[PDB]
From a paper:
Adding all seven stabilizing mutations led to a seven-fold increase in expression and 20 °C increase in the Tm over the Cα/Cβ subunit harboring only the Cα166/Cβ173 disulfide (denoted “wild-type”). We obtained a 1.76 Å crystal structure of the stabilized Cα/Cβ subunit. In the crystal structure and the Rosetta model, phenylalanine 139 (Cα S139F) fills a partially buried cleft in the structure and forms tight packing interactions with the sidechain of Cα 129Q. Notably, the orientation of the interaction leaves the polar groups on the glutamine open for forming hydrogen bonds with water. Despite being solvent exposed, Cβ D155P has the largest impact on protein stability of the seven mutations. The Rosetta energy calculations favor the proline because the residue has backbone torsion angles (ϕ = −73.4°, ψ = 52.3°) compatible with the closed ring of the proline. Isoleucine 150 (Cα T150I) packs tightly with surrounding residues and removal of the threonine does not leave any buried polar groups without a hydrogen-bond partner. Instead, the crystal structure shows the threonine adopting a different rotamer to form a hydrogen bond with the backbone on the other end of the loop’s turn (backbone nitrogen of Cα 193N). The crystal structure shows Cβ S170D hydrogen bonding with the backbone nitrogen atom of Cα 171R (which was not previously participating in a hydrogen bond) and allowing the arginine’s sidechain to become more solvent-exposed. Rosetta modeled the arginine and aspartic acid to form a bidentate hydrogen bond, however the crystal structure shows that they form just one hydrogen bond so that the arginine can better pack with neighboring residues. Interestingly, the Cβ H139R mutation forms charge-charge interactions as well as a potential π-stacking interaction across the Cα/Cβ interface that may stabilize/lock-down the conformation of the Cα C-terminus, which also shows enhanced protection from HDX.
Author numbering:
A (entry chain A): 122 to 209
B (entry chain B): 118 to 246
Amino acid sequence: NPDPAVYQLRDSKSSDKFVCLFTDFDSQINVSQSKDSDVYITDKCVLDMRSMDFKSNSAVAWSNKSDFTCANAFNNSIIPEDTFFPSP
Amino acid sequence: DLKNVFPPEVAVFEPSKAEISRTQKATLVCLATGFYPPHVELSWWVNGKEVHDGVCTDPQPLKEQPALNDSRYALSSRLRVSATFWQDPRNHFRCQVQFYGLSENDEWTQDRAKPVTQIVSAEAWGRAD
Ligand SMILES: [Mg+2]
Ligand SMILES: [Mg+2]
Ligand SMILES: [Mg+2]
């Protein structure tokens, strides 16, 4: 089943840099493009783990702006109310 | 003249403990940034072998400055594996980006390195969360 979540992933070479991964949402969700040109948001990508007969959707967001967080990254999109935002 | 050509910087972002705990899966993300022209090939390498299963790479690079004509670009990719596979300290993960840029023939008088055709990579080793 879907398990929508926005996870924070840290750079393997500098722990203070990160990206935000919106993942495991159902295919009716529309990921909107960013309105700020300093914030980058990819299109939805469908990833297939053949080994587990498992498909999942994701989008990635990042920015150099200090006010960017995983909590506000996908604000321009309509996403599920049950989306999980783990404390970092 | 040719000074608008830039190779990518590449970084790997490690799976979050939260995802591992909640889903028993682990998503790595690779970002290639700051490149021009938008001509790259991104691949994932696990223990020295190229992988295609569990990979999704953006179909198109995005412009970092969409107003600019020769904006530099970015590209992302994800590789998703099992939590146990990521947590195994014997597994080495590498994101590889082939950039197609200048040749040896090209003149260059900029202070930065000559943005030639090249591969830029970033890496992470598996570990317990
Ligand atoms: Mg929010
Ligand atoms: Mg919203
Ligand atoms: Mg290798």
